[PDB]
Each structure stands twice: as C-alpha cells, then as structure tokens.
Amino acid sequence: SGFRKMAFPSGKVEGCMVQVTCGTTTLNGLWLDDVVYCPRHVICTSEDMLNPNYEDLLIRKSNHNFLVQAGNVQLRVIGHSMQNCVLKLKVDTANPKTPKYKFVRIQPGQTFSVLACYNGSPSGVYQCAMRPNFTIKGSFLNGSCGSVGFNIDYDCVSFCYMHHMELPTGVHAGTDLAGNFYGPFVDRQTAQAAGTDTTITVNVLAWLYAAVINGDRWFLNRFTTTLNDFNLVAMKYNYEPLTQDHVDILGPLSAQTGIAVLDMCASLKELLQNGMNGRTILGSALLEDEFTPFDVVRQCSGVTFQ
Amino acid sequence: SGFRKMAFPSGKVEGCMVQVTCGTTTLNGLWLDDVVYCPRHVICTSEDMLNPNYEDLLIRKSNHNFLVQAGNVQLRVIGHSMQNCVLKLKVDTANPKTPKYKFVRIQPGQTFSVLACYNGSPSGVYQCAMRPNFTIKGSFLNGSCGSVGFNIDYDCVSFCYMHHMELPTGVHAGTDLAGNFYGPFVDRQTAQAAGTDTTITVNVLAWLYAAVINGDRWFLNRFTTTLNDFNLVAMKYNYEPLTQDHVDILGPLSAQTGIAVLDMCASLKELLQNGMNGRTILGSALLEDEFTPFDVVRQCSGVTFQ
Ligand SMILES: *[C@](O)(C(=O)NCC1CC1)[C@H](C[C@@H]1CCNC1=O)NC(=O)[C@@H]1[C@@H]2[C@H](CN1C(=O)[C@@H](NC(=O)NC(C)(C)C)C(C)(C)C)C2(C)C
Numbered sequence: 238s239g240f241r242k243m244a245f246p247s248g249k250v251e252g253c254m255v256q257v258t259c260g261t262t263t264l265n266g267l268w269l270d271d272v273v274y275c276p277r278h279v280i281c282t283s284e285d286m287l288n289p290n291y292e293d294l295l296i297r298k299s300n301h302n303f304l305v306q307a308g309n310v311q312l313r314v315i316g317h318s319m320q321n322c323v324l325k326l327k328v329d330t331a332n333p334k335t336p337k338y339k340f341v342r343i344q345p346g347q348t349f350s351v352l353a354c355y356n357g358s359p360s361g362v363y364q365c366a367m368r369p370n371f372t373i374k375g376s377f378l379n380g381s382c383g384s385v386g387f388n389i390d391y392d393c394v395s396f397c398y399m400h401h402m403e404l405p406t407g408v409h410a411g412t413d414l415a416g417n418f419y420g421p422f423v424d425r426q427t428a429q430a431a432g433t434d435t436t437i438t439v440n441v442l443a444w445l446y447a448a449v450i451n452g453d454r455w456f457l458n459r460f461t462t463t464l465n466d467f468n469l470v471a472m473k474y475n476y477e478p479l480t481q482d483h484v485d486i487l488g489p490l491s492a493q494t495g496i497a498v499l500d501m502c503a504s505l506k507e508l509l510q511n512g513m514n515g516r517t518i519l520g521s522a523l524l525e526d527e528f529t530p531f532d533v534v535r536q537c538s539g540v541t542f543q
Numbered sequence: 544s545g546f547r548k549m550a551f552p553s554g555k556v557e558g559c560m561v562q563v564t565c566g567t568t569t570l571n572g573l574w575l576d577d578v579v580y581c582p583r584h585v586i587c588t589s590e591d592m593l594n595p596n597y598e599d600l601l602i603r604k605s606n607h608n609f610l611v612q613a614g615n616v617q618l619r620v621i622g623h624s625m626q627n628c629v630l631k632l633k634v635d636t637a638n639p640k641t642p643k644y645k646f647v648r649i650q651p652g653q654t655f656s657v658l659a660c661y662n663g664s665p666s667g668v669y670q671c672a673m674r675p676n677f678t679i680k681g682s683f684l685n686g687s688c689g690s691v692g693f694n695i696d697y698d699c700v701s702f703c704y705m706h707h708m709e710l711p712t713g714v715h716a717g718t719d720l721a722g723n724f725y726g727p728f729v730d731r732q733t734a735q736a737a738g739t740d741t742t743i744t745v746n747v748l749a750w751l752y753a754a755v756i757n758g759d760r761w762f763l764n765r766f767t768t769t770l771n772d773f774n775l776v777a778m779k780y781n782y783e784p785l786t787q788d789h790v791d792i793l794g795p796l797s798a799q800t801g802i803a804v805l806d807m808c809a810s811l812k813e814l815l816q817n818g819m820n821g822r823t824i825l826g827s828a829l830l831e832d833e834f835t836p837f838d839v840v841r842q843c844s845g846v847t848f849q
C-alpha cells in the first residue's frame with residue numbers, strides 16, 4: 238500500500254537529451270533517430286524576444302550556427318526546419334539510445350512526467366497534469382526550455398510536452414512535440430495571462446478511490462446524488478463538469494472498491510461543502526486532482542514498463 | 544520558478560534492476576559489477592516467514608537454486624553470502640551498465656528517490672524521506688521487495704535503501720544496502736510497531752524558505768524567537784528539536800532570502816499556533832517536511848547530474 242505522486246522511470250528519455258546552442262542561447266533538445274527537437278526561440282537574441290518573425294530569423298541561419306552537444310560529443314547539423322514552434326535539426330548521427338516512441342497531444346486533465354534538464358543534463362523528474370487552462374504547474378528555471386514531458390506505455394515513450402516559457406503567475410506553458418502550444422499562448426514576450434483554472438473533477442474522484450483502496454474511508458457517506466445535482470455543486474466550487482464519459486472511466490475503480498461512482502460524487506459534494514475539518518486524505522489536506530483514473534489503477538495494481 | 548517533489552533521474556538505477564527467483568518467491572535484486580543484492584527473505588517459504596533462521600536456511604541452498612533474470616538474459620550464480628539482512632549473489636557476468644556508486648546509510652530526515660520495481664522492471668519513481676521513526680511512507684505492493692532508494696551526486700549513485708516490508712499502519716521498513724535495517728525492525732513476521740513519528744523541523748523550515756524563494760510570503764512576520772523558545776513550541780506540536788547545527792545548515796537559504804533562520808522559526812511558530820487559516824503554501828495545506836535544505840537549494844538553483 239501507500240500512494241505517492243509517482244513519475245515514470247526516466248532512463249529512456251535521459252538518453253535522448255542534448256544541449257542545443259545557437260548564438261548566446263543555450264537550451265535542451267531531444268535527440269530521436271537523427272533529429273534534434275528544441276524550442277524555436279533558440280534562434281532569438283536579447284532584443285529578438287519582443288516580436289520576432291521566426292521565419293525571417295531562421296532563413297538567416299546556417300547549419301553550422303547550431304552547436305549540438307550530446308555529452309562530450311558534438312553533433313553536426315546537416316539540415317534544419319521549423320514545424321510550428323519547434324525547430325528540427327537533422328544531424329548526421331542517429332541516437333543509438335532512441336527508444337520506441339510516439340508524439341501525442343494530450344487533453345487537459347491528463348498527467349505526465351517531466352524530466353527537468355539544464356545544458357542537456359537531467360536535473361530531476363516529477364509528475365504534472367495539463368491544467369484545464371492549458372498551463373502546467375511545473376518547476377522550471379532559466380535553462381530548462383526543451384525539457385520534455387512524457388508517459389510510457391509498456392516499452393513506448395509517448396512524448397507530449399516540451400517546455401518553452403513561464404507565465405507571470407509562476408506557471409508554465411509549452412508545446413507538444415510538433416510545436417503546437419497547449420492553450421492560447423505564443424512564444425513571444427507579449428502580454429499573456431493563463432486563464433482561470435478549474436479543478437479536475439474526474440481526477441479528484443480517482444484520488445478518492447485511491448484513498449479507499451488504501452484504507453482511508455472517513456469521507457464516505459450513505460448518500461447518493463445525480464450527475465446533474467453533482468455538477469450543480471461542482472460549478473459552484475470551480476470544478477470541471479463531470480461527464481457520463483468520466484463516470485464510465487471511473488468504472489473499474491468503482492468496481493474494485495464497491496462504491497458506485499455517483500456515491501463517491503456524494504462524498505465529494507460533502508467534502509466541498511464542509512471541508513475536511515482538520516482531517517487528511519492520503520497525506521493531503523487538499524483535494525488532489527493530478528492523478529488520473531489510470532494513474533490510480535497503475536499505482537494500486539503495480540503495472541511496470543520494459 | 545515552481546516547486547515540486549522532485550526525484551532524481553532514475554536511468555542509472557534502472558539499468559541495475561534484475562529479477563531474483565528462489566523457490567516460490569520472486570523479487571527484485573540490484574546488479575552492480577558481478578554481485579546481485581536482494582533481501583534475504585527470498586530464501587523463505589510460506590511457513591518460513593514466522594521465525595526463520597536464515598543461516599540454517601541459506602546453508603541448505605545451492606547456487607543453482609537462484610534464478611536471476613536480467614531482462615531476457617538469465618544470470619548464472621557462482622556464489623552466495625549473507626550480509627545482515629541482504630543476500631549477495633556472485634554472478635559470472637559484471638553488469639556493463641554499473642554506474643559509479645556508493646552504499647550509504649542515511650540519517651532520519653534525509654530524503655531519497657525510490658525506484659519502485661516489480662519482476663525486475665521499474666514501475667515508477669518518487670521522492671521519500673526517512674522518517675524520524677525510521678519508516679518511510681512509500682508506495683509498495685507485493686513484488687516490490689528489493690526496490691532501492693538512492694541519491695545521485697554529480698555522476699555517482701549513492702544507494703541508501705532497499706525495500707523489505709510493510710508495517711500494519713501502511714508504512715514501510717527496509718535496510719541499507721549492507722542489510723542493516725533502519726529502525727528496530729526485523730525481517731520476521733512478529734509483532735512490530737513503527738514507533739511514534741515526529742515532524743522534521745529543519746525540513747519544514749527549508750520548505751518555508753523554498754516558498755519565499757518562489758513568491759509566497761504571507762506567513763512571514765516581524766517577530767523573532769530564541770532557539771530555546773522555538774523548541775518549547777516545537778515539542779508541543781510533535782516536531783523534532785531544531786539544533787544549532789540545523790540552523791547552520793539553513794544558512795545559505797537564510798542568506799539568499801534575507802530572512803534570519805530564527806525569524807523563520809518565529810513564522811513557523813505562528814503557523815503551528817494558528818494554522819494556515821484556509822491558505823496554502825507551495826500548493827500544500829499542510830506544513831511539508833520531506834524537502835531537505837539541500838533539496839531546496841538543488842531545485843531552486845538547478846543543479847544537474849552527469
Ligand atoms: C527558456 O527559454 C530557457 O530555458 N532558456 C534558456 C536560455 C535562456 C538561456 C526559458 C524558461 C523560463 C525561464 C524561467 N522559467 C522558465 O520556464 N523561457 C523563456 O525564457 C521564455 C522565452 C522568452 C521569454 N520567456 C519566458 O519564459 C519569460 N516569460 C514571459 O515573458 N512570459 C510572457 C507570457 C510573454 C509574459 C520570462 C520568464 C523570462 C520573463 C520566450 C517566451 C520567447
């Protein structure tokens with residue numbers, strides 16, 4: 238037993254991180270086969286950041302302007318192209334440590350592991366969720382652009398995030414690995430605000446099921462509720478609407494614990510209306526929303542990865 | 544910015560995990576050079592667990608009774624010996640992925656990353672602290688024995704924990720990599736209780752400094768306190784005594800933020816005496832004690848590892 242904010246083992250991604258240096262700018266890139274992916278604002282300078290035209294900026298670049306370092310080994314760039322907000326550097330050497338991989342654009346509410354990197358060297362790994370407002374509450378310092386977020390499924394790394402920027406509220410915005418930002422953000426220093434966030438209701442319910450699996454039941458009650466009546470209380474507390482489709486996803490957890498999804502909604506309703514009154518759930522004094530139903534089942538049943 | 548419960552990149556350890564199978568028992572082992580380390584109760588059976596004599600049990604074993612699998616490759620055991628509560632299996636092949644490493648026995652209050660494993664395959668990675676009562680609040684299912692905890696320093700993996708067992712309160716107990724249990728625990732199914740835990744005061748103070756570094760200052764106050772007067776309030780709230788030596792460790796954090804260690808103690812005192820009154824710190828509604836002063840400095844300044 239026990240329940241922890243668990244990240245995927247990071248080794249498969251560690252072997253893909255490289256340093257990309259152009260001009261006075263150094264950041265991380267992701268080396269898969271013979272391509273290095275990195276944020277396109279690596280071609281920017283101290284006065285470019287304000288309103289750069291990256292098409293113009295990139296046509297002025299030569300391959301040899303791109304210094305790619307894989308450890309103590311310098312990769313030669315033999316081509317470059319821009320795809321949305323990512324730069325793709327064709328190099329003469331295919332990464333021999335390239336895992337089986339996919340690029341995936343995730344939905345808000347889904348979680349992933351972030352391998353935080355500086356100068357192509359991993360610093361740490363942690364679990365994030367894509368917030369409903371398409372920010373992530375990460376831990377990112379200057380140097381960390383190009384660090385990627387990912388999930389692993391048996392043996393395949395599904396890359397879903399690459400870090401680009403920090404918003405004035407201390408949260409983070411980035412792209413999928415095809416360079417499309419999550420949310421309305423652009424890689425420009427212009428006024429941008431995160432948008433009002435909301436709590437991921439289906440994930441809170443998953444975590445409540447995690448709690449029950451793990452012996453916390455103080456929050457359960459004999460009541461039930463309708464999905465309509467639940468969503469009328471959720472709206473009030475700035476929780477995402479729960480859909481029948483969320484209900485069906487919570488099925489297996491509902492089945493393992495013997496608590497109907499709608500009964501767990503009645504518990505969450507009372508938790509929203511009364512607070513926790515000085516009690517904790519799974520070592521938290523807040524309702525936790527960065528575990529998906531899949532995360533809970535993974536950790537409470539022990540799925541591995543090769 | 545941002546602050547997350549960050550684990551070390553796990554790749555260096557992933558390459559060392561193997562499956563050790565003896566009799567009806569399968570668990571994880573740690574393959575470094577030509578030795579596989581694993582919990583000695585791998586030699587136990589369904590009725591051995593009650594009061595086994597592992598010396599007697601092990602002399603009855605042959606090398607060929609030990610099935611060690613490194614992926615799709617079966618390691619041949621050419622010797623075995625018991626060191627405290629760990630078994631050391633000499634194998635004919637040295638792990639080519641053996642990192643630079645050390646075995647270290649940590650002090651309560653220190654943190655580490657746990658690479659949770661089943662059948663020699665990594666499941667996830669998370670950050671733990673050694674509690675003052677020498678348990679760890681982990682996430683461990685059946686199959687997870689032999690998973691290790693570790694820290695990394697530049698390029699060296701310092702192994703400090705190997706998982707053995709779960710206590711009836713849902714917490715976990717294990718050994719260092721030389722087989723010595725942390726705390727009064729034994730690898731026997733006899734009555735054992737964790738001992739009363741306490742909060743790691745110096746770590747809470749570190750995390751408060753993390754908060755200030757990251758823009759949370761609502762909890763600060765103009766007051767100060769003496770170490771004596773602080774420790775009189777700490778005792779009351781079942782916090783560890785703060786020593787002058789803890790104070791000196793908190794120096795660099797005190798210097799970077801401009802808040803004297805004793806002033807942050809006055810803040811913590813008021814937080815203990817008044818609660819947080821519906822406010823959060825670093826996304827927590829509890830005082831967090833599983834970040835060391837070093838953890839905070841690592842994450843707030845961006846140290847990496849090669
Ligand atoms: C990233 O480019 C990086 O790691 N680069 C290393 C090169 C500089 C040596 C950084 C990572 C952020 C820094 C702090 N936390 C981070 O996640 N990203 C940036 O520097 C981006 C790039 C220009 C500005 N920027 C920012 O994140 C900045 N925020 C910002 O301007 N945001 C709004 C929404 C436009 C207001 C800031 C944090 C440096 C002020 C790009 C956006 C092109």
Ligand SMILES: *[C@](O)(C(=O)NCC1CC1)[C@H](C[C@@H]1CCNC1=O)NC(=O)[C@@H]1[C@@H]2[C@H](CN1C(=O)[C@@H](NC(=O)NC(C)(C)C)C(C)(C)C)C2(C)C
Binds near residue numbers: 570685687711
């Ligand atoms: C470990 O041996 C393992 O992973 N083995 C895989 C082999 C069995 C297929 C497990 C890991 C624990 C199981 C659940 N969570 C865990 O961390 N450890 C054990 O099974 C140990 C070994 C015997 C009993 N045991 C326990 O953890 C048990 N606890 C217990 O008996 N504790 C007290 C303090 C003695 C009461 C229990 C959880 C299975 C009941 C050993 C202690 C020899």
